[PDB]
């Protein structure tokens, strides 16, 4: 009978500790999932991305059946380390419902460090709230 | 501890989680960025941006992009500190490399601030985009036009007669032009493109030696039309024909 009341009051802090850390990232929109504009965002470091040069792919794909989302913007703010990434701000093509899109860049690191990027996608002009910003953690290159 | 007061936290935090709670705050104005161009000349055109404020911000950074025939001498900048409602600015100049043709003519500049709302200790990120016009007198050495026959497209207007010499400062034939019906429009690095239909043609067509170069000029001819007519009050927006022959 002591074990039952020990579980609830430890679980009651658990619901609070989760939701206080859930809303800490949902308002910052760190999650790679969305509901209004309905695509997810997966991203990866590719095999050819090794050494001073480094290549970063990015995967967009709509989850509608008939609603092509139209002309969004991808930009990645990042703490300035010694790499360049010469384009840094694309205009994304028209996402058809069903196909996945590879989007590739070229990190050019000069020396050996490691620091995480944050890649955002925005709606066209009005909402700067930045859905689907994915805090990509980088690999330490040489 | 405080088993009723801590219960007020989870009974309140479950409201925003049940809702969407994405951008619940009024994010109407927290920045303002405007770019203005002076009346300078060939390749190096000086240009000026601005920044406004309403809240103290941090982690701010401003970048600016063009099409790769154009390039910028002074690349992207920083703006370190913010006080409530101050302004700062940075000037720079656009360099021109010896390519042939830029795709579009206007670039855009983008800023990246980070407001620190109390849900996070650091700043949640935001991005504000502005755009800016660019003139065409930096790609400018208008020679004598050549009345020849090549690829053609036809436009027309509502009010037909418009003197081309009045549409801008006189680009071709800085010497004594004895003709108003000159259509001298050599605007690239090593090309030859004229316009047509000064007086006797109500249809306003244009010829081009190569079919690459009409995109930079006809929209410019569309805008310089609309830059003329608001001082007259006609509001004409009509014509084209035969998109199949291109």
Curated annotation (Swiss-Prot), chain A:
Cellular compartment(s): Cell projection, Cilium membrane; Cytoplasm; Cytoplasm, Cytoskeleton, Microtubule organizing center, Centrosome, Centriolar satellite
Tissues where the protein occurs: Highly expressed in the kidney. Also found in fetal tissue, testis, retina, adipose tissue, heart, skeletal muscle and pancreas.
| Record note on quaternary structure | Part of BBSome complex, that contains BBS1, BBS2, BBS4, BBS5, BBS7, BBS8/TTC8, BBS9 and BBIP10. Interacts with the C-terminus of RAB3IP. Interacts with CCDC28B and ALDOB. Interacts with PKD1.
Related illness: Ciliary dysfunction leads to a broad spectrum of disorders, collectively termed ciliopathies. Overlapping clinical features include retinal degeneration, renal cystic disease, skeletal abnormalities, fibrosis of various organ, and a complex range of anatomical and functional defects of the central and peripheral nervous system. The ciliopathy range of diseases includes Meckel-Gruber syndrome, Bardet-Biedl syndrome, Joubert syndrome, nephronophtisis, Senior-Loken syndrome, and Jeune asphyxiating thoracic dystrophy among others. Bardet-Biedl syndrome 1: A syndrome characterized by usually severe pigmentary retinopathy, early-onset obesity, polydactyly, hypogenitalism, renal malformation and intellectual disability. Secondary features include diabetes mellitus, hypertension and congenital heart disease. Bardet-Biedl syndrome inheritance is autosomal recessive, but three mutated alleles (two at one locus, and a third at a second locus) may be required for clinical manifestation of some forms of the disease.
Its function, per the record, reads: The BBSome complex is thought to function as a coat complex required for sorting of specific membrane proteins to the primary cilia. The BBSome complex is required for ciliogenesis but is dispensable for centriolar satellite function. This ciliogenic function is mediated in part by the Rab8 GDP/GTP exchange factor, which localizes to the basal body and contacts the BBSome. Rab8(GTP) enters the primary cilium and promotes extension of the ciliary membrane.
Record's protein name: BBSome complex member BBS1
Source organism per UniProt: Homo sapiens
Q: What is the lineage of its organism?
A: Eukaryota, Metazoa, Chordata, Craniata, Vertebrata
UniProtKB/Swiss-Prot annotation, chain B:
Binding partners and assembly: Part of BBSome complex, that contains BBS1, BBS2, BBS4, BBS5, BBS7, BBS8/TTC8, BBS9 and BBIP10. Interacts with LZTL1; the interaction mediates the association of LZTL1 with the BBsome complex and regulates BBSome ciliary trafficking.
Give the stretch of the parent protein shown, with its full length: 396 to 641 of 887
Signal peptide (from-to): none
Originating organism = Homo sapiens (Human)
From the UniProt record, give one GO term of the biological process aspect: protein localization to cilium
Q: What induces it?
A: Down-regulated by parathyroid hormone.
Instruction: List the GO terms this entry assigns under cellular component, sorted alphabetically.
Output: BBSome; centriolar satellite; ciliary basal body; ciliary membrane; ciliary transition zone; cilium; cytosol; membrane
Coiled coil stretches, renumbered: none
What disease does the record describe for this protein?
A chromosomal aberration involving PTHB1 has been found in Wilms tumor. Translocation t(1;7)(q42;p15) with OBSCN. Bardet-Biedl syndrome 9: A syndrome characterized by usually severe pigmentary retinopathy, early-onset obesity, polydactyly, hypogenitalism, renal malformation and intellectual disability. Secondary features include diabetes mellitus, hypertension and congenital heart disease. Bardet-Biedl syndrome inheritance is autosomal recessive, but three mutated alleles (two at one locus, and a third at a second locus) may be required for clinical manifestation of some forms of the disease.
Protein's cellular compartments = Cytoplasm, Cytoskeleton, Microtubule organizing center, Centrosome; Cell projection, Cilium membrane; Cytoplasm; Cytoplasm, Cytoskeleton, Microtubule organizing center, Centrosome, Centriolar satellite
Q: Which coarse location class describes where this protein primarily resides?
A: cytoplasm
**Tissues expressed in:** Widely expressed. Expressed in adult heart, skeletal muscle, lung, liver, kidney, placenta and brain, and in fetal kidney, lung, liver and brain.
Record keywords, A-Z: Bardet-Biedl syndrome, Cell membrane, Cell projection, Chromosomal rearrangement, Ciliopathy, Cilium, Cilium biogenesis/degradation, Cytoplasm, Cytoskeleton, Disease variant, Intellectual disability, Membrane, Obesity, Protein transport, Sensory transduction, Transport, Vision
Purpose of the protein:
The BBSome complex is thought to function as a coat complex required for sorting of specific membrane proteins to the primary cilia. The BBSome complex is required for ciliogenesis but is dispensable for centriolar satellite function. This ciliogenic function is mediated in part by the Rab8 GDP/GTP exchange factor, which localizes to the basal body and contacts the BBSome. Rab8(GTP) enters the primary cilium and promotes extension of the ciliary membrane.
Query: Which protein, by its recorded name, is this?
Result: Protein PTHB1
Q: Which gene encodes it?
A: BBS9
